[model samples]
Target: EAEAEFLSRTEGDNCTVFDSQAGFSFDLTPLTKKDAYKVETDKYEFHINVCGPVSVGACPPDSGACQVSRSDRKSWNLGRSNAKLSYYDGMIQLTYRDGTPYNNEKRTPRATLITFLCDRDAGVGFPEYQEEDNSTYNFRWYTSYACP
Candidate 1:
């Protein structure tokens, strides 16, 4: 355990890891095949899967992430699958890509960036929407499951 683990542990589609620095074992097994982690802001609702592709109840086929504009009244596919996972210090950066074009326009590609911050006393706690930038929706999720 010389460094934080990334893309090193897996269990049937779960994102599993062990952070040596903090002596924490992170596992998403309980969350898999269950409801996805979600949060809603005044402007939109966000959904994500810590394990494999998203299961947002009734999301778009093959969607790995989901977002719904409060006013638009439609669910937008953020990505088709988990695109990236990076861990350093005490944070996890999970990203999803390949979303459909916004307004059917080529330039506006949708995506989601979920930053998991360390919180030893948290459980995928309330998420903070940091606003969508350049079609990439950013969010901050505090969870002990990411503590490292």
Candidate 2:
């Protein structure tokens, strides 16, 4: 039983050795064969096999309720009509093939990433599901130990 567990600590303590912050990245290429995609995180060493395709579409028009004139509508170009990932540190957001933010409204073209945490260490908990269909996954788990 030589595993490190989560414990609360007060300020002004020697916590550098216990700091667990880490950077992570994953690819979101379309899984054409299975109609799914793959996502993996560093540090924690886990993967989410999403059983769905990356959706893409057009960009929504500018807000209409404004008195001031807005710029012209940006078109979802051909190069943007491809899978891509955007990370917001603690949280992650995906863009449509047209490079538009995936919003329930406004954003015409959007992507839906349906992910599933098939396997992970019991000590490493799970990520927060920002979307109902796993479109947004947020991870902020920290521990002074390693996943066996």
Model 1 TM: 0.70
Candidates in order have lDDT scores of 0.65, 0.26
- Per-residue lDDT of 17-122 in model 2, one digit per residue for the tens? 1223332333323222121222232212212222122222222222100011123333322112222333332223333233234455564432333222324443
Candidate 2, TM-score vs. the true structure? 0.24
lDDT of 2 at 28: 27
With a 3 Å backbone cut-off (N, CA, C), the pairs that clash in candidate 1 are: none
Candidate 2 wrong stretches, greater than 4 Å: 1-23, 28-34, 37-81, 97-107, 110-148
